[PDB]
């Protein structure tokens, strides 16, 4: 302002950015086998 | 963002933006087999 004349200018600006990525997992595998022989029929148990 | 300019007069400005997105996926599967082979005794024979 100079002296009548008056001037005023105000500017405001804000920005915000956010990113969140999360991944959690588990996989399990297990195999077991057997084999046997027996050299009366009652013993088959 | 808000910008207000006045020179003598009054000015008012307001702006708001909101964004929210969520994405989740779950995948589970199993495959298993059970093989078994046995044989009786049957002491008899056909030795003829």
């Amino acid at each position: 302002r100079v002296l009548f004349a008056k001037k005023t200018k105000v500017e405001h600006r804000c920005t915000t950015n956010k990113l969140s990525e999360k991944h959690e997992g588990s996989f399990i595998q297990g195999a077991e086998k057997s084999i046997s022989l027996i050299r009366s029929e009652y013993g088959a148990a | 963002s808000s910008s207000r300019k006045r020179s003598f007069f009054r000015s008012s400005s307001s702006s708001s933006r909101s964004y929210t997105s969520h994405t989740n996926e779950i995948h589970k599967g199993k495959s298993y087999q059970l093989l078994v082979v046995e044989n009786t005794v049957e002491v008899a024979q056909f030795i003829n």
Side-chain angles (χ1 to χ4, degrees), chain A residues 1-32 42-45, chain B residues 1-32 44:
Chain A
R1 58 182 181 179
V2 173
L3 180 61
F4 183 75
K6 185 177 180 180
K7 291 181 181 179
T8 300
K9 292 180 182 179
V10 176
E11 185 177 1
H12 183 76
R13 182 184 294 170
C14 319
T15 187
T16 303
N17 193 0
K18 187 176 180 180
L19 194 145
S20 177
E21 184 177 1
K22 183 177 180 180
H23 53 87
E24 179 178 1
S26 175
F27 63 97
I28 61 170
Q29 59 182 357
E32 59 183 1
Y42 184 74
Chain B
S1 179
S2 296
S3 179
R4 292 186 295 272
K5 292 182 181 180
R6 58 182 293 165
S7 296
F8 182 75
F9 183 75
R10 184 180 63 84
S11 179
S12 66
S13 178
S14 179
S15 67
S16 66
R17 184 179 293 171
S18 179
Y19 179 75
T20 300
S21 178
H22 188 273
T23 298
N24 47 359
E25 292 178 354
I26 296 170
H27 303 286
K28 58 183 180 180
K30 71 175 179 180
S31 178
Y32 65 95

Coordinates of all heavy atoms in Angstrom, one line a residue, unseen atoms left out:
Chain A
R1 N 0.8 -1.2 0.0 CA 0.0 0.0 0.0 C 0.9 1.2 0.0 O 1.8 1.3 0.8 CB -1.0 0.0 1.2 CG -0.3 -0.1 2.6 CD -1.3 -0.1 3.7 NE -0.7 -0.1 5.0 CZ -1.3 -0.1 6.2 NH1 -2.7 -0.1 6.2 NH2 -0.7 -0.2 7.3
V2 N 0.6 2.2 -0.9 CA 1.3 3.4 -1.0 C 0.4 4.6 -1.0 O -0.6 4.6 -1.8 CB 2.2 3.4 -2.3 CG1 2.9 4.7 -2.5 CG2 3.2 2.3 -2.3
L3 N 0.7 5.6 -0.2 CA -0.1 6.8 -0.2 C 0.7 8.0 0.0 O 1.4 8.2 1.0 CB -1.2 6.7 1.0 CG -2.1 7.9 1.1 CD1 -2.9 8.2 -0.1 CD2 -3.0 7.7 2.4
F4 N -5.8 7.0 -2.4 CA -5.5 5.8 -1.6 C -5.5 4.5 -2.4 O -6.4 4.3 -3.1 CB -6.4 5.7 -0.4 CG -6.1 4.6 0.6 CD1 -5.0 4.8 1.5 CD2 -6.8 3.5 0.6 CE1 -4.7 3.8 2.4 CE2 -6.5 2.5 1.5 CZ -5.4 2.6 2.4
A5 N -4.4 3.7 -2.1 CA -4.3 2.4 -2.8 C -3.8 1.4 -1.8 O -2.9 1.6 -1.1 CB -3.3 2.5 -4.0
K6 N -4.5 0.2 -1.8 CA -4.1 -0.9 -0.9 C -4.3 -2.2 -1.7 O -5.3 -2.4 -2.3 CB -5.0 -0.9 0.3 CG -4.6 -1.9 1.4 CD -5.4 -1.8 2.6 CE -5.1 -2.8 3.7 NZ -5.9 -2.7 4.9
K7 N -3.3 -3.1 -1.6 CA -3.3 -4.4 -2.2 C -2.8 -5.4 -1.3 O -1.8 -5.2 -0.6 CB -2.5 -4.4 -3.5 CG -3.1 -3.5 -4.6 CD -2.2 -3.6 -5.9 CE -2.8 -2.7 -7.0 NZ -2.0 -2.7 -8.2
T8 N -3.5 -6.6 -1.2 CA -3.0 -7.7 -0.4 C -3.4 -9.0 -1.1 O -4.5 -9.2 -1.6 CB -3.7 -7.6 1.0 OG1 -3.4 -6.4 1.6 CG2 -3.3 -8.8 1.9
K9 N -2.4 -9.9 -1.1 CA -2.6 -11.2 -1.7 C -2.0 -12.3 -0.8 O -0.8 -12.2 -0.3 CB -1.9 -11.3 -3.1 CG -2.5 -10.4 -4.1 CD -1.8 -10.5 -5.5 CE -2.4 -9.5 -6.5 NZ -1.7 -9.6 -7.8
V10 N -2.8 -13.3 -0.6 CA -2.4 -14.4 0.3 C -2.7 -15.7 -0.5 O -3.8 -15.9 -1.0 CB -3.1 -14.4 1.7 CG1 -2.7 -15.6 2.5 CG2 -2.7 -13.1 2.4
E11 N -1.7 -16.7 -0.5 CA -1.9 -18.0 -1.1 C -1.4 -19.1 -0.2 O -0.3 -18.9 0.4 CB -1.1 -18.0 -2.5 CG -1.3 -19.2 -3.3 CD -0.6 -19.2 -4.6 OE1 0.0 -18.2 -4.9 OE2 -0.8 -20.2 -5.4
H12 N -2.1 -20.2 -0.2 CA -1.8 -21.3 0.7 C -2.2 -22.6 0.0 O -3.2 -22.7 -0.7 CB -2.5 -21.2 2.0 CG -2.1 -22.3 3.0 ND1 -0.9 -22.4 3.7 CD2 -2.8 -23.5 3.3 CE1 -0.9 -23.4 4.4 NE2 -2.0 -24.1 4.2
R13 N -1.3 -23.6 0.0 CA -1.5 -24.9 -0.7 C -0.7 -25.9 0.0 O 0.5 -25.7 0.2 CB -1.1 -24.8 -2.1 CG -1.4 -26.0 -2.9 CD -0.9 -25.9 -4.4 NE -1.7 -24.9 -5.1 CZ -1.4 -24.5 -6.3 NH1 -0.3 -24.9 -6.9 NH2 -2.2 -23.6 -6.9
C14 N -1.3 -27.1 0.3 CA -0.6 -28.2 0.9 C -1.0 -29.5 0.2 O -2.1 -29.6 -0.3 CB -0.8 -28.3 2.4 SG -0.8 -26.7 3.4
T15 N -0.1 -30.5 0.3 CA -0.4 -31.8 -0.3 C 0.1 -32.9 0.6 O 1.0 -32.6 1.4 CB 0.2 -31.9 -1.7 OG1 -0.3 -33.2 -2.3 CG2 1.7 -31.9 -1.7
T16 N -0.5 -34.0 0.5 CA -0.1 -35.2 1.4 C -0.4 -36.5 0.6 O -1.5 -36.6 0.0 CB -0.9 -35.2 2.7 OG1 -0.7 -33.9 3.4 CG2 -0.4 -36.3 3.6
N17 N 0.6 -37.4 0.6 CA 0.4 -38.7 0.0 C 1.0 -39.7 0.9 O 2.1 -39.6 1.5 CB 1.2 -38.7 -1.4 CG 0.8 -39.9 -2.2 OD1 0.0 -40.7 -1.8 ND2 1.4 -39.9 -3.4
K18 N 0.3 -40.9 1.0 CA 0.8 -42.0 1.8 C 0.4 -43.3 1.1 O -0.6 -43.4 0.5 CB 0.1 -41.9 3.2 CG 0.6 -42.9 4.2 CD 0.0 -42.7 5.6 CE 0.5 -43.7 6.6 NZ -0.1 -43.5 7.9
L19 N 1.3 -44.3 1.3 CA 1.1 -45.6 0.8 C 1.6 -46.6 1.7 O 2.7 -46.5 2.3 CB 1.8 -45.8 -0.6 CG 1.4 -47.0 -1.5 CD1 1.4 -46.6 -2.9 CD2 2.3 -48.2 -1.2
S20 N 0.9 -47.7 2.0 CA 1.2 -48.8 2.9 C 0.8 -50.1 2.3 O -0.4 -50.3 2.2 CB 0.6 -48.5 4.3 OG 0.9 -49.6 5.2
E21 N 1.7 -51.0 2.1 CA 1.5 -52.3 1.5 C 2.1 -53.3 2.4 O 3.3 -53.2 2.7 CB 1.9 -52.4 0.1 CG 1.6 -53.8 -0.6 CD 2.0 -53.8 -2.0 OE1 2.6 -52.8 -2.5 OE2 1.8 -54.9 -2.7
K22 N 1.4 -54.3 2.8 CA 1.9 -55.4 3.7 C 1.3 -56.7 3.3 O 0.1 -56.8 3.1 CB 1.6 -55.1 5.2 CG 2.1 -56.1 6.1 CD 1.8 -55.8 7.6 CE 2.4 -56.8 8.5 NZ 2.1 -56.5 10.0
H23 N 2.1 -57.7 3.1 CA 1.7 -59.1 2.7 C 2.5 -60.1 3.5 O 3.7 -60.1 3.4 CB 1.8 -59.3 1.2 CG 3.2 -59.0 0.7 ND1 4.2 -59.9 0.6 CD2 3.7 -57.9 0.1 CE1 5.3 -59.4 0.1 NE2 5.0 -58.1 -0.2
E24 N 1.8 -61.0 4.2 CA 2.4 -62.0 5.0 C 1.6 -63.3 4.9 O 0.4 -63.3 5.1 CB 2.5 -61.6 6.5 CG 3.1 -62.6 7.4 CD 3.3 -62.2 8.8 OE1 2.8 -61.1 9.1 OE2 3.8 -62.9 9.6
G25 N 2.3 -64.4 4.5 CA 1.7 -65.7 4.4 C 2.7 -66.8 4.5 O 3.9 -66.6 4.2
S26 N 2.3 -68.0 4.9 CA 3.1 -69.1 5.1 C 2.5 -70.4 4.5 O 1.2 -70.6 4.6 CB 3.4 -69.4 6.6 OG 4.2 -70.6 6.7
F27 N 3.3 -71.2 3.9 CA 2.8 -72.5 3.3 C 3.7 -73.6 3.8 O 4.9 -73.5 3.8 CB 2.8 -72.4 1.8 CG 4.1 -72.2 1.1 CD1 4.8 -73.3 0.6 CD2 4.6 -70.9 1.0 CE1 6.1 -73.1 0.0 CE2 5.8 -70.7 0.4 CZ 6.6 -71.8 -0.1
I28 N 3.1 -74.7 4.2 CA 3.9 -75.8 4.8 C 3.4 -77.1 4.1 O 2.2 -77.3 3.7 CB 3.7 -75.9 6.3 CG1 2.2 -76.1 6.7 CG2 4.2 -74.7 7.0 CD1 2.0 -76.5 8.1
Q29 N 4.3 -78.1 4.0 CA 4.0 -79.3 3.3 C 4.9 -80.4 4.0 O 6.1 -80.2 4.2 CB 4.2 -79.3 1.8 CG 5.6 -78.9 1.4 CD 5.8 -78.9 -0.1 OE1 4.8 -79.1 -0.9 NE2 6.9 -78.5 -0.6
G30 N 4.3 -81.6 4.3 CA 5.0 -82.7 4.8 C 4.4 -84.0 4.5 O 3.2 -84.2 4.7
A31 N 5.2 -84.9 4.0 CA 4.7 -86.2 3.5 C 5.6 -87.3 4.2 O 6.8 -87.2 4.3 CB 4.8 -86.4 2.0
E32 N 4.9 -88.3 4.7 CA 5.5 -89.5 5.4 C 4.9 -90.8 4.8 O 3.6 -90.8 4.7 CB 5.4 -89.4 6.9 CG 3.9 -89.3 7.4 CD 3.9 -89.2 8.9 OE1 4.9 -89.1 9.6 OE2 2.8 -89.1 9.5
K33 N 5.7 -91.8 4.6 CA 5.2 -93.1 4.1 C 5.9 -94.2 4.8 O 6.9 -94.0 5.6 CB 5.5 -93.2 2.6
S34 N 5.5 -95.4 4.6 CA 6.0 -96.6 5.3 C 5.8 -97.8 4.4 O 4.9 -97.8 3.5 CB 5.4 -96.8 6.7
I35 N 6.5 -98.9 4.7 CA 6.4 -100.1 4.0 C 6.9 -101.2 4.9 O 7.9 -101.1 5.6 CB 7.1 -100.1 2.6
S36 N 6.2 -102.4 4.8 CA 6.6 -103.5 5.7 C 6.0 -104.8 5.2 O 5.1 -104.8 4.4 CB 6.1 -103.2 7.1
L37 N 6.6 -105.9 5.6 CA 6.2 -107.2 5.2 C 6.3 -108.1 6.4 O 7.1 -107.9 7.3 CB 7.0 -107.8 4.0
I38 N 5.5 -109.2 6.4 CA 5.4 -110.1 7.5 C 5.5 -111.5 6.9 O 4.5 -112.0 6.2 CB 4.2 -110.0 8.4
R39 N 6.6 -112.3 7.1 CA 6.7 -113.6 6.5 C 6.4 -114.6 7.6 O 6.9 -114.6 8.7 CB 8.1 -113.8 6.0
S40 N 0.3 -117.6 10.5 CA -1.1 -117.7 10.0 C -1.5 -116.3 9.6 O -0.8 -115.3 9.6 CB -2.0 -118.2 11.1
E41 N -2.8 -116.2 9.2 CA -3.4 -114.9 8.8 C -3.6 -113.9 10.0 O -3.8 -112.8 9.8 CB -4.7 -115.1 8.1
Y42 N -3.5 -114.4 11.2 CA -3.7 -113.6 12.4 C -2.6 -112.6 12.5 O -2.8 -111.5 13.0 CB -3.9 -114.4 13.6 CG -4.2 -113.6 14.9 CD1 -5.5 -113.1 15.1 CD2 -3.2 -113.4 15.9 CE1 -5.8 -112.4 16.2 CE2 -3.5 -112.7 17.0 CZ -4.8 -112.1 17.2 OH -5.1 -111.4 18.3
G43 N -1.4 -112.9 12.1 CA -0.3 -112.1 12.2 C -0.3 -110.9 11.3 O 0.6 -110.0 11.4
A44 N -1.3 -110.8 10.4 CA -1.4 -109.7 9.5 C -1.7 -108.4 10.2 O -1.5 -107.3 9.6 CB -2.5 -110.0 8.4
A45 N -2.3 -108.4 11.4 CA -2.6 -107.2 12.2 C -1.3 -106.4 12.4 O -1.3 -105.2 12.3 CB -3.3 -107.6 13.5
Chain B
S1 N -6.3 -27.3 -0.2 CA -5.7 -26.1 -0.6 C -6.7 -25.0 -0.4 O -7.9 -25.1 -0.9 CB -5.1 -26.1 -2.0 OG -4.6 -24.8 -2.4
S2 N -6.3 -23.8 0.2 CA -7.2 -22.7 0.4 C -6.5 -21.4 0.1 O -5.4 -21.2 0.6 CB -7.8 -22.7 1.8 OG -8.6 -23.8 2.0
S3 N -7.1 -20.6 -0.8 CA -6.5 -19.3 -1.1 C -7.5 -18.2 -0.9 O -8.6 -18.2 -1.4 CB -6.0 -19.3 -2.6 OG -5.5 -18.0 -2.9
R4 N -7.1 -17.2 -0.1 CA -8.0 -16.0 0.2 C -7.2 -14.7 0.0 O -6.1 -14.6 0.5 CB -8.5 -16.1 1.7 CG -9.4 -17.3 2.0 CD -10.0 -17.2 3.4 NE -8.9 -17.4 4.4 CZ -8.5 -18.6 4.8 NH1 -9.1 -19.7 4.4 NH2 -7.6 -18.6 5.7
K5 N -7.8 -13.9 -0.8 CA -7.2 -12.6 -1.2 C -8.3 -11.5 -1.0 O -9.3 -11.6 -1.6 CB -6.6 -12.6 -2.6 CG -5.4 -13.5 -2.8 CD -4.9 -13.4 -4.2 CE -3.7 -14.3 -4.3 NZ -3.1 -14.3 -5.7
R6 N -8.0 -10.5 -0.3 CA -8.9 -9.3 -0.1 C -8.1 -8.0 0.0 O -7.0 -8.0 0.5 CB -9.7 -9.5 1.2 CG -8.8 -9.6 2.5 CD -9.7 -9.8 3.7 NE -10.5 -8.6 4.0 CZ -11.5 -8.6 4.9 NH1 -11.8 -9.7 5.5 NH2 -12.1 -7.5 5.1
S7 N -8.6 -7.0 -0.7 CA -8.0 -5.7 -0.8 C -9.0 -4.6 -0.9 O -9.8 -4.6 -1.8 CB -7.0 -5.6 -2.0 OG -5.9 -6.6 -1.8
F8 N -9.1 -3.8 0.2 CA -10.1 -2.7 0.2 C -9.4 -1.3 0.2 O -8.3 -1.2 0.8 CB -11.0 -2.9 1.4 CG -12.1 -1.8 1.4 CD1 -13.2 -1.8 0.5 CD2 -12.0 -0.8 2.3 CE1 -14.2 -0.9 0.6 CE2 -13.0 0.2 2.4 CZ -14.1 0.2 1.5
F9 N -13.9 -5.5 0.8 CA -13.9 -6.7 0.1 C -13.4 -7.9 0.9 O -12.5 -7.8 1.7 CB -13.0 -6.6 -1.2 CG -12.9 -7.8 -2.1 CD1 -14.0 -8.1 -2.9 CD2 -11.8 -8.6 -2.1 CE1 -13.9 -9.2 -3.7 CE2 -11.7 -9.7 -2.9 CZ -12.8 -10.0 -3.7
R10 N -14.1 -9.1 0.8 CA -13.7 -10.3 1.5 C -13.9 -11.5 0.6 O -14.9 -11.6 -0.1 CB -14.6 -10.4 2.8 CG -14.2 -11.6 3.7 CD -15.1 -11.6 4.9 NE -16.5 -11.8 4.5 CZ -17.1 -13.0 4.3 NH1 -16.3 -14.1 4.4 NH2 -18.4 -13.1 4.0
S11 N -13.0 -12.4 0.7 CA -13.0 -13.6 -0.1 C -12.7 -14.8 0.8 O -11.8 -14.7 1.7 CB -12.0 -13.6 -1.2 OG -12.0 -14.8 -2.0
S12 N -13.4 -15.9 0.7 CA -13.2 -17.1 1.4 C -13.2 -18.3 0.5 O -14.1 -18.4 -0.3 CB -14.2 -17.3 2.5 OG -15.5 -17.5 2.0
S13 N -12.3 -19.2 0.7 CA -12.2 -20.5 -0.1 C -11.7 -21.6 0.7 O -10.8 -21.4 1.5 CB -11.2 -20.3 -1.3 OG -11.2 -21.5 -2.1
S14 N -12.3 -22.8 0.5 CA -11.9 -24.0 1.3 C -12.2 -25.2 0.4 O -13.2 -25.3 -0.3 CB -12.8 -24.1 2.6 OG -12.4 -25.3 3.3
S15 N -11.2 -26.1 0.4 CA -11.2 -27.3 -0.4 C -10.6 -28.4 0.4 O -9.5 -28.3 1.0 CB -10.5 -27.1 -1.8 OG -9.1 -27.0 -1.6
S16 N -11.3 -29.6 0.4 CA -10.8 -30.8 1.1 C -11.1 -32.0 0.2 O -12.1 -32.2 -0.4 CB -11.5 -30.9 2.4 OG -12.9 -31.2 2.2
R17 N -10.0 -32.9 0.1 CA -10.1 -34.1 -0.6 C -9.6 -35.3 0.2 O -8.6 -35.2 0.9 CB -9.3 -34.0 -1.9 CG -9.4 -35.2 -2.8 CD -8.6 -35.0 -4.1 NE -9.1 -34.0 -5.0 CZ -8.5 -33.5 -6.0 NH1 -7.3 -33.9 -6.4 NH2 -9.1 -32.5 -6.7
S18 N -10.4 -36.4 0.2 CA -10.0 -37.6 0.9 C -10.1 -38.8 0.0 O -11.1 -38.9 -0.7 CB -10.9 -37.7 2.1 OG -10.6 -38.9 2.9
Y19 N -9.1 -39.7 0.1 CA -9.1 -40.9 -0.7 C -8.6 -42.0 0.2 O -7.5 -41.9 0.8 CB -8.3 -40.7 -2.0 CG -8.2 -41.9 -2.8 CD1 -9.3 -42.3 -3.6 CD2 -7.0 -42.7 -2.8 CE1 -9.2 -43.4 -4.4 CE2 -7.0 -43.9 -3.6 CZ -8.1 -44.2 -4.4 OH -8.0 -45.3 -5.2
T20 N -9.3 -43.1 0.2 CA -8.9 -44.3 0.9 C -9.3 -45.5 0.2 O -10.5 -45.7 -0.2 CB -9.5 -44.3 2.3 OG1 -9.1 -43.1 3.0 CG2 -9.1 -45.5 3.1
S21 N -8.3 -46.4 -0.1 CA -8.6 -47.7 -0.8 C -7.8 -48.8 -0.1 O -6.6 -48.6 0.3 CB -8.2 -47.5 -2.3 OG -8.4 -48.8 -2.9
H22 N -8.5 -49.9 0.0 CA -7.9 -51.1 0.7 C -8.2 -52.3 -0.2 O -9.3 -52.5 -0.7 CB -8.4 -51.3 2.1 CG -7.7 -52.4 2.8 ND1 -8.1 -53.8 2.7 CD2 -6.7 -52.4 3.7 CE1 -7.3 -54.5 3.5 NE2 -6.4 -53.7 4.1
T23 N -7.1 -53.1 -0.4 CA -7.3 -54.3 -1.3 C -6.5 -55.5 -0.6 O -5.3 -55.4 -0.3 CB -6.7 -54.1 -2.7 OG1 -7.5 -53.1 -3.3 CG2 -6.8 -55.4 -3.5
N24 N -7.2 -56.6 -0.3 CA -6.7 -57.7 0.3 C -7.2 -59.0 -0.4 O -8.3 -59.1 -0.8 CB -7.0 -57.8 1.8 CG -8.5 -57.5 2.1 OD1 -9.3 -57.3 1.2 ND2 -8.8 -57.6 3.4
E25 N -6.3 -60.0 -0.5 CA -6.6 -61.2 -1.2 C -6.0 -62.4 -0.4 O -4.9 -62.3 0.1 CB -6.1 -61.2 -2.7 CG -6.8 -60.3 -3.6 CD -6.3 -60.3 -5.0 OE1 -5.3 -60.9 -5.2 OE2 -6.9 -59.6 -5.9
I26 N -6.7 -63.5 -0.3 CA -6.3 -64.7 0.4 C -6.5 -65.9 -0.6 O -7.6 -66.1 -1.1 CB -7.0 -64.9 1.7 CG1 -6.7 -63.8 2.7 CG2 -6.6 -66.2 2.3 CD1 -7.5 -63.7 3.9
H27 N -5.5 -66.7 -0.8 CA -5.5 -67.9 -1.6 C -4.9 -69.0 -0.9 O -3.7 -69.0 -0.6 CB -4.9 -67.6 -3.0 CG -5.4 -66.4 -3.7 ND1 -6.6 -66.5 -4.4 CD2 -4.9 -65.2 -3.9 CE1 -6.9 -65.3 -4.9 NE2 -5.8 -64.5 -4.7
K28 N -5.6 -70.1 -0.6 CA -5.1 -71.3 0.1 C -5.7 -72.5 -0.6 O -6.9 -72.6 -0.9 CB -5.5 -71.2 1.6 CG -7.0 -71.1 1.9 CD -7.2 -71.0 3.4 CE -8.7 -70.9 3.7 NZ -9.0 -70.8 5.1
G29 N -4.8 -73.5 -0.8 CA -5.2 -74.8 -1.4 C -4.2 -75.8 -1.1 O -3.0 -75.6 -1.0
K30 N -4.7 -77.1 -1.0 CA -3.8 -78.2 -0.8 C -4.2 -79.4 -1.7 O -5.3 -79.5 -2.1 CB -3.9 -78.7 0.7 CG -5.2 -79.3 1.1 CD -5.1 -79.9 2.5 CE -6.4 -80.5 2.9 NZ -6.4 -81.0 4.3
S31 N -3.2 -80.2 -2.0 CA -3.4 -81.4 -2.8 C -2.5 -82.5 -2.3 O -1.3 -82.4 -2.2 CB -3.1 -81.1 -4.3 OG -3.3 -82.3 -5.1
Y32 N -3.2 -83.6 -1.9 CA -2.4 -84.8 -1.3 C -3.1 -86.1 -1.8 O -4.3 -86.1 -2.0 CB -2.4 -84.7 0.2 CG -3.7 -84.8 0.9 CD1 -4.2 -86.0 1.3 CD2 -4.5 -83.7 1.1 CE1 -5.4 -86.2 2.0 CE2 -5.8 -83.8 1.7 CZ -6.2 -85.0 2.1 OH -7.4 -85.2 2.8
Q33 N -2.3 -87.1 -1.9 CA -2.7 -88.4 -2.3 C -2.3 -89.5 -1.3 O -1.2 -89.3 -0.6 CB -2.2 -88.8 -3.7
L34 N -3.0 -90.5 -1.2 CA -2.8 -91.6 -0.2 C -2.8 -92.9 -1.0 O -3.8 -93.5 -1.3 CB -3.8 -91.7 0.9
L35 N -1.6 -93.4 -1.4 CA -1.4 -94.7 -2.1 C -1.1 -95.8 -1.1 O -0.2 -95.6 -0.2 CB -0.3 -94.6 -3.2
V36 N -1.7 -97.0 -1.3 CA -1.5 -98.1 -0.4 C -1.6 -99.4 -1.2 O -2.5 -99.5 -2.1 CB -2.6 -98.1 0.8
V37 N -0.8 -100.3 -0.9 CA -0.8 -101.6 -1.6 C -0.4 -102.7 -0.5 O 0.6 -102.6 0.2 CB 0.3 -101.7 -2.7
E38 N -1.3 -103.7 -0.5 CA -1.1 -104.8 0.5 C -1.2 -106.1 -0.2 O -1.5 -106.2 -1.4 CB -2.2 -104.7 1.6
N39 N -1.1 -107.2 0.5 CA -1.1 -108.6 0.0 C -1.4 -109.6 1.1 O -0.7 -109.5 2.1 CB 0.2 -108.9 -0.8
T40 N -2.3 -110.4 0.9 CA -2.6 -111.5 1.9 C -1.5 -112.5 2.0 O -0.5 -112.5 1.3 CB -4.0 -112.1 1.6
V41 N -1.7 -113.4 2.9 CA -0.7 -114.5 3.1 C -1.0 -115.7 2.2 O -0.2 -115.9 1.2 CB -0.7 -115.0 4.6
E42 N -2.1 -116.3 2.4 CA -2.6 -117.4 1.5 C -1.5 -118.5 1.3 O -0.9 -118.7 0.2 CB -3.1 -116.9 0.2
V43 N -1.1 -119.1 2.4 CA 0.0 -120.1 2.5 C -0.1 -121.1 1.4 O 0.9 -121.7 1.0 CB 0.1 -120.7 3.9
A44 N -1.3 -121.4 1.0 CA -1.5 -122.5 0.0 C -0.8 -122.1 -1.4 O -0.4 -120.9 -1.6 CB -3.0 -122.7 -0.3
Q45 N -0.7 -123.1 -2.2 CA 0.0 -122.9 -3.5 C -0.5 -123.8 -4.5 O -1.3 -124.8 -4.2 CB 1.6 -123.1 -3.3
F46 N -0.1 -123.6 -5.8 CA -0.5 -124.4 -6.9 C 0.7 -125.1 -7.5 O 0.8 -125.1 -8.8 CB -1.2 -123.6 -7.9
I47 N 1.5 -125.7 -6.7 CA 2.8 -126.3 -7.1 C 2.7 -127.5 -8.0 O 3.7 -128.1 -8.4 CB 3.7 -126.6 -5.9
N48 N 1.4 -127.9 -8.3 CA 1.1 -129.1 -9.1 C 2.0 -129.2 -10.3 O 2.1 -128.2 -11.1 CB -0.3 -129.1 -9.5

